Amino acid sequence: EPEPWFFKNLSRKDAERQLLAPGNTHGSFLIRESESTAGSFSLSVRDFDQNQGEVVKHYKIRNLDNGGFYISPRITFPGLHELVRHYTNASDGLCTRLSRPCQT
């Protein structure tokens, strides 16, 4: 649709406050447009650190030419929806498995 994890104009610092709000837990995520790098997307994910507690981590989602997304060129996807589906099924290298979209 509007896909529930897609918050395209959210800054890094607001993505962080958003994911660390009540209602979110480990694996809670959102995809936004990149702040530092124009043209890309960034995946923001809530995670559990052994010694630090709740933390937000950020990955770069990059464009393969035209219609290909990846975080690592190892696996690429036709759209952001398939990327999200993959890392919900298995962390596959990611700091954590993705569970549910950022609750607002």
């Binding site: 890094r12 530092s36 960034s42 990955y59 700091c95």
Partner: peptide, 11 residues
Amino acid sequence: EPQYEEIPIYL
């Protein structure tokens, strides 16, 4: 400039 994570390779 702001920190991003990467997916590691297995070595």
